[PDB]
Ligand binder design. Structure first.
Ligand SMILES: [Mg+2]
Ligand SMILES: [Zn+2]
Ligand SMILES: [Zn+2]
Ligand SMILES: [Zn+2]
Ligand SMILES: [Zn+2]
Lengths: 212, 134, 138, 56, 110, 376, 146, 46, 47
RNA sequence: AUCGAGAGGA
DNA sequence: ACGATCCTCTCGAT
């Protein structure tokens, strides 16, 4: 029987043949089986990565350090956009633990399996096809881990290979002919500022202390 | 005076050549939608809250607003205001971490909403020094 | 630039009208094949028709923009060699300075209409500090 | 910073006035002129680091 | 700038990209995450069984990161974790995952 | 620009889809006021608002049929309302307002804001474009068509000359509003009533010794004697359910200026000919491509027309929150604000034209003047 | 003494431009830091840092000045110690520091563990990564198992 | 002589209290300036 | 590669394929803030 | 202090 | 998909 000619439509897999959509759930099965020798031939590693993993079971949750707070305030609140989107998510997620075991109604489930998938795609990205997002406190648009992670002024590019740093300084500059080539006239007030941790030593103390 | 620097008669600077004034104004208001939470302009001092600024307050009288002929500079508080959260948490603007001058005029009005309003102006005279552009 | 200004926008129709009341055989009754020497007319990017002898028509228009009976804003362009006549009343068009020249002169050649005459009456208005820019305009 | 040359260790000479002062002829590699160009300074914290700057 | 550790010190020499087995996710957690709120249980100010904390670092610059103490200037945040319901795709994966099927086949999956 | 907003424009925006299921008329406008909470209504003076972060803006009064206010309107300093507009020199120093100050700005919360002219490509213009190599179409005459008094329904018609040089039989097609594909002109021409192979050519080629051009068209005519009739021209654009649909498009969105009413059919055929005439003048190299950088085929949108693109947009809102206290009345409800505050936000930011953001209007039209030096 | 060359001398109208040095001469020597990153803050206005850009790095590498790159990329700026599982390469650890206690639950590892050293921004990313369902396994020996 | 505010428009030595809010003595303009200070200031005339 | 143009996804296909990063690259040792196999870091030091 | 928008210095 | 570096500053918002 067969392999459909498959289609991406939003966040769903859709097939022709010779139309049944691929419910999220379908695809877990599969892989949950597929072979070891099948994996690997194509890119996988028994222990470190498996196609069933490629799809979402359970979603970790990033602790505060990753997404924290406060404001203009004190008594009146604070938060980043992951705590907000890391809600739209624990949000619809109980909207569905509240149907299956409470009020249960056939084709009006799936209105809300796309929410829960959708916010879980959004919490990871949103500069894609169709709708971006926004409010439900700030307006726009949004946040996402990805753009945090993304090119320039974003982690890796802007915080890891290029950080802002201590003991530095900056001014205007001008030329002065009675200075030797390898010198640099540092103005005083700055020298009064930047510091160099020296270690105490028989050798230095006398001078050293007269500084302290 | 190379690769475009130029040399200036420090004598004639003194006589007053290329001098300027330099005012800068700071601003403040009181609260938001509170039926019981209202910033207050005052000259603070702890009162269970104790997060007040590194710098000095003693240049503010009681309305919490420096007087005019007063010379400020450093991290000096120019406008004391406290915001009570449960209590007297400081929240008062100090002068630029770099500027220094003299208060010139201080204004006290209000906004559409019957709001307490303040705009403090500080004046400095800046003199053609070494690195200045022209 | 110093002397630049910008269209603010008039109303097309009082002209449209004037046009259809001075030749400008309108479009519908158009017969391209039995009247090719037809400067076709254009208003605000619309084709309202045609016109034989558009010449005897512009003059008139110009005298009417320059006397003041048609807004001085409205631009009046007659392209001779492509047989079109575009009249613009759009808003947001920049435009400008200048004086006029019509050879309008008796004892000799092509001249500027202006003269020490007007200009001296213009300064007249500098020391009494009724001749404004605008009177130059009209 | 489009060279190694836009960076180089120098010898400090504290002075009055508030401009980083430098030698004409060390201009090019920086590509500075003096009609306002601004310039950064960093300060090594390890004895090694000091070495790395003064030697390489 | 943080305390003595008994632990030793190593330099990084290998990095293993790889993925998330729900397996570990709930093996590795401390979280449960049962409610979608941040902290107010009837104006009551503290944290909650819900979001941001049931064994997780803090705010009022306080040490209760689970007998962990040392707090927010040494609390490598420790992970939360949350069971979903009926599974879901994973965005930057859609397109390999579409390619995976245009590659395996139905019902037995070979 | 401003004056001719107020003075005229404004009043015309308020008359329109204005009417209800209620009829506004004369809008009335105040020299700027201010209602401080708990109080009379003061007379507002520029220097005064620059100081207490008030908005030099005046009162919006509408004369509503079976006297009434809907918002306020930021006033262009030194415009016909700004009290500074009639002021003597010594009258000025008096209001503490510099007499060298030339005004031309607004004042919103003490910050003087300037509306930045905006440059854009004119409409209702005829434009031809040779298109690249790697493309089948080879020239295209186009028109960003849309109405001067009434909306901003934006409707772009293209007349592409599918077929590069030589590449077999150069056919001509066009483009239409909410529609499926292109159209060989001759249908369309038949569809506007012009039917005879050649009563058509007149609408295009204007002199008959121009075989060259004629011939250029020899192959269009041929994509159509598969249709020799009004009703089956209208046909091809999908019975009676979908004929209609076309007798519309070819009145409501096909060349909207000109008109949208009933019988103005030939008024358009002719045009469409005109388009094609230049489209072909340009393909036979008798005449040059159309230069996209002629200042003459662009406009600057000053402050009037901007306040204008906002005022409509909110006046349509106050207008329709109202089709709503009222929908729910069955058995004054106006939210003034919407407007008196929408205006403020745009004038206050730079997101020219409310909430959504979208309005990458983004110009940050509205900036904070500059005042380092007079000449700036 | 007279000057050998005659000179150009005259009145010429000159301009004083905003931009005076004393309003620029910021200098930092360790100060406040952001909340997220733990990196110094932007702006002299708040005693920030200067950006030692991707670009200046290239040049340090150019010179061959390794150690200095670490110092600048770690000791000034982010720098942070984290513990790790000596098995399941993870920031899954638990500093019950004091009570010489270590554990890596589940893994149940109590003797295979690691204190290591990285840019706090590092840890971040990794957590960010993890929180996007990916493992950034941290291994200790130049060694792959074979 | 013991002073506190001064409204701007007319020039009256007002001096009033936390809670008579703001406004003048028949010249109502809520503006109001802060006096001068009295620890008289020393200038270097340089 | 991360340290350049398409960053999030190189991270993902890296995630899925279980790439094992050597960490012999300047770019990556800068990320873990350790010495670089560079001039000063190319040899080792002993006794 | 996070965020978006324009203005300016090389 | 990218797109000079660094740089100081002002206005406005859930
Ligand atoms: Mg220069
Ligand atoms: Zn902890
Ligand atoms: Zn199969
Ligand atoms: Zn572990
Ligand atoms: Zn008075």
């Amino acid at each position: 029987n067969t392999q459909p000619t498959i289609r991406k439509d939003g966040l769903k897999l859709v097939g022709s043949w010779k139309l049944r959509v691929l419910s999220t759930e379908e695809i877990l099965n599969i892989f949950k089986h597929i072979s070891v020798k099948d994996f690997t031939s194509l890119g996988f590693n028994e222990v470190f990565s498996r196609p069933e993993w490629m799809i979402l079971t359970c979603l970790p949750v990033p602790p505060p350090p990753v997404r924290p707070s406060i404001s203009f305030n004190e008594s009146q609140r604070g938060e980043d956009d992951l705590t907000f989107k890391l809600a739209d998510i624990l949000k619809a997620n109980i909207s569905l633990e509240t149907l299956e075991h409470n009020g249960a109604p056939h084709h009006a489930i799936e209105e809300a399996e796309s929410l829960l998938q959708f916010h879980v795609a959004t919490y990871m990205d949103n500069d894609i096809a169709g709708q971006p997002q926004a409010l439900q406190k700030s307006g726009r648009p949004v946040k996402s881990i990805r753009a945090r992670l993304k090119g320039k002024e974003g982690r890796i590019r802007g915080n890891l290979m290029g950080k802002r740093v201590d003991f530095s300084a900056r001014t205007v500059i001008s030329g002065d002919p009675n200075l030797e080539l390898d010198q640099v006239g540092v103005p005083k007030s700055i020298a009064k500022t930047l510091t160099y941790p020296e270690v105490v030593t028989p050798y230095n103390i006398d001078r050293l202390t007269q500084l302290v | 005076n190379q690769e475009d620097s130029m040399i200036m008669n420090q004598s004639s600077i003194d006589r007053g050549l290329f001098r300027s004034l330099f005012f800068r104004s700071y601003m403040d208001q009181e609260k938001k939608y509170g039926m019981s939470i209202t910033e207050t302009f005052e000259k603070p001092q702890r009162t269970n809250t104790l997060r007040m600024k590194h710098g000095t307050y003693d240049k503010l009288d009681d309305d919490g607003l420096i007087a005019p002929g007063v010379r400020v500079s450093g991290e000096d508080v120019i406008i004391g205001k406290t915001t009570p959260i449960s209590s007297k948490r400081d929240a008062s603007t100090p002068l630029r971490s770099t500027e220094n001058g003299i208060v010139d005029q201080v204004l006290v009005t209000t906004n559409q909403d019957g709001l307490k309003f303040v705009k403090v102006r500080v004046r400095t005279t800046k003199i053609p020094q070494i690195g200045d552009k022209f | 630039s110093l002397m630049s200004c910008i269209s603010v926008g008039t109303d097309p129709m009082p002209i449209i009208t004037f046009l259809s009341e001075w030749g400008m055989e309108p479009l519908e009754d158009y017969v391209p094949h039995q009247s090719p020497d037809a400067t076709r007319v254009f208003v605000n990017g619309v084709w309202h028709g045609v016109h034989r002898n558009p010449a005897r028509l512009m003059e008139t228009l110009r005298t009417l923009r320059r006397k003041g009976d048609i807004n001085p804003e409205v631009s009046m362009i007659r392209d001779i060699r492509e047989k079109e006549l575009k009249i613009f009343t759009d808003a947001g068009r920049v435009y400008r300075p200048l004086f006029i020249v019509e050879d309008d002169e008796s004892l000799g050649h092509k001249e500027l209409k202006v003269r020490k005459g007007h200009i001296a009456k213009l300064m007249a208005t500098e020391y009494q500090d009724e001749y404004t820019w605008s009177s130059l305009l009209n | 910073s489009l060279h190694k040359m836009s960076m180089m260790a120098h010898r400090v000479k504290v002075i009055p006035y508030s401009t980083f002062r430098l030698n004409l002829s060390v201009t090019s590699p920086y590509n500075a002129d003096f009609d306002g160009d601004e310039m950064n300074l960093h300060v090594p914290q390890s004895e090694e680091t000091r070495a790395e700057l003064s030697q390489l | 700038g943080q305390q003595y550790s008994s632990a030793p010190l190593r330099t990084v020499k290998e990095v293993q990209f790889g993925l998330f087995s729900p397996e570990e996710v709930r093996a590795i957690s401390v979280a449960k995450i049962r409610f979608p709120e941040t902290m107010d249980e009837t104006q009551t100010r503290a944290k909650i069984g819900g979001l941001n904390d049931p064994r997780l670092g803090s705010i009022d610059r306080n040490l209760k990161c689970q007998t962990c103490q040392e707090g927010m200037n040494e609390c490598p945040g420790h992970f939360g974790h949350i069971d979903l319901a009926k599974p879901v795709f994973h965005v930057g994966f859609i397109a390999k995952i579409k390619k995976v099927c245009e590659c395996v086949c139905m019902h037995c999956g070979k | 620009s401003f004056n001719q907003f107020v003075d005229y424009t404004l009043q015309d925006i308020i008359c329109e889809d204005s009417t209800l299921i209620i009829s506004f008329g004369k809008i009335y406008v105040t020299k700027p006021m201010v209602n401080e909470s708990d109080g009379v209504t003061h007379a507002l003076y520029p220097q005064e608002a620059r100081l207490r972060n008030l908005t030099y803006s005046s009162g919006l009064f509408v004369d509503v049929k079976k006297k009434v206010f809907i918002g306020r309107l930021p006033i262009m300093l030194r415009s016909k309302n700004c009290y500074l507009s009639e002021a003597t020199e010594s009258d000025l120093y008096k209001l503490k307002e510099c007499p060298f100050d030339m005004g031309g700005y607004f004042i919103i919360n003490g910050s003087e804001k300037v509306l930045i002219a905006q440059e854009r490509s004119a409409g209702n213009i005829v434009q031809v474009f040779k298109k690249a190599a790697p493309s089948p179409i080879s020239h295209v005459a186009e028109i960003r068509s849309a109405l001067e008094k009434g909306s901003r329904f934006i409707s772009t018609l293209q007349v592409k000359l599918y077929g590069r040089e030589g590449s077999s039989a150069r056919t001509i097609k066009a483009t239409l509003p909410y529609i499926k594909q292109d159209i060989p002109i001759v249908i369309i021409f038949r569809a506007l009533g012009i039917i005879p192979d050649g009563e058509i050519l007149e609408h295009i080629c204007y002199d008959v010794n121009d075989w060259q051009m004629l011939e250029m068209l020899k192959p269009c005519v041929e994509d159509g004697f598969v249709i020799q009739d009004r009703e089956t021209a209208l046909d091809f654009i999908g019975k009676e359910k979908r004929i209609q649909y076309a007798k519309d498009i070819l009145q409501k969105e096909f060349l909207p200026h000109i008109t949208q009413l009933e019988g103005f059919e030939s008024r358009k055929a002719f045009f469409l000919g005109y388009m094609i005439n230049r489209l072909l003048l340009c393909a036979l190299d008798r005449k040059d491509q159309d230069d996209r950088d002629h200042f003459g085929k662009k406009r600057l949108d000053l402050a009037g027309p901007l306040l204008a693109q906002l005022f409509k947009t909110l006046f349509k809102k106050l207008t329709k929150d109202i089709f709503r206290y009222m929908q729910r009345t069955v058995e004054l409800a106006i939210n003034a604000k919407t407007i008196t505050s929408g205006l403020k936000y745009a004038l206050a930011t730079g997101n020219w034209g409310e909430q959504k953001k979208a309005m990458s209007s983004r110009a940050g039209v509205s900036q904070v003047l500059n005042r380092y030096t007079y000449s700036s | 003494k007279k000057l050998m060359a005659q000179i150009f001398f005259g009145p010429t109208y000159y301009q004083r431009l905003r931009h005076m040095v004393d309003d620029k001469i910021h200098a930092r020597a360790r100060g406040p830091m952001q909340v997220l990153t733990r990196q110094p803050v932007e702006g002299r206005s708040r005693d920030g840092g200067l950006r030692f850009g991707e670009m200046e790095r290239d040049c340090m590498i150019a010179h061959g000045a390794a150690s200095f790159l670490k110092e600048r990329l770690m000791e000034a700026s982010d720098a942070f110690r984290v513990h790790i599982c000596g098995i399941c390469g993870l920031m899954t650890v638990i500093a019950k520091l004091n009570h010489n206690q270590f554990e890596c639950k589940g893994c149940d590892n109590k003797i295979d563990i690691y204190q290591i050293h990285i840019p706090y921004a590092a840890k971040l990313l990794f957590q960010e990564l993890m929180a996007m369902n990916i493992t950034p396994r941290l291994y200790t020996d130049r060694s792959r198992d074979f | 002589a013991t002073l506190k505010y001064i409204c701007a428009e007319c020039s009256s030595k007002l001096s009033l209290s936390r809670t008579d809010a703001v406004r003048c003595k028949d010249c109502g303009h809520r503006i109001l300036l802060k006096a001068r200070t009295k620890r008289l200031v020393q200038f270097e005339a340089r | 590669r991360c340290s350049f143009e398409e960053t999030v996804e190189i991270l993902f296909e890296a995630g899925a394929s279980a790439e094992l990063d050597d960490c012999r690259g300047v770019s990556e040792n800068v990320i873990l803030g350790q010495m670089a196999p560079i001039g000063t870091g190319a040899f080792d030091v002993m006794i």
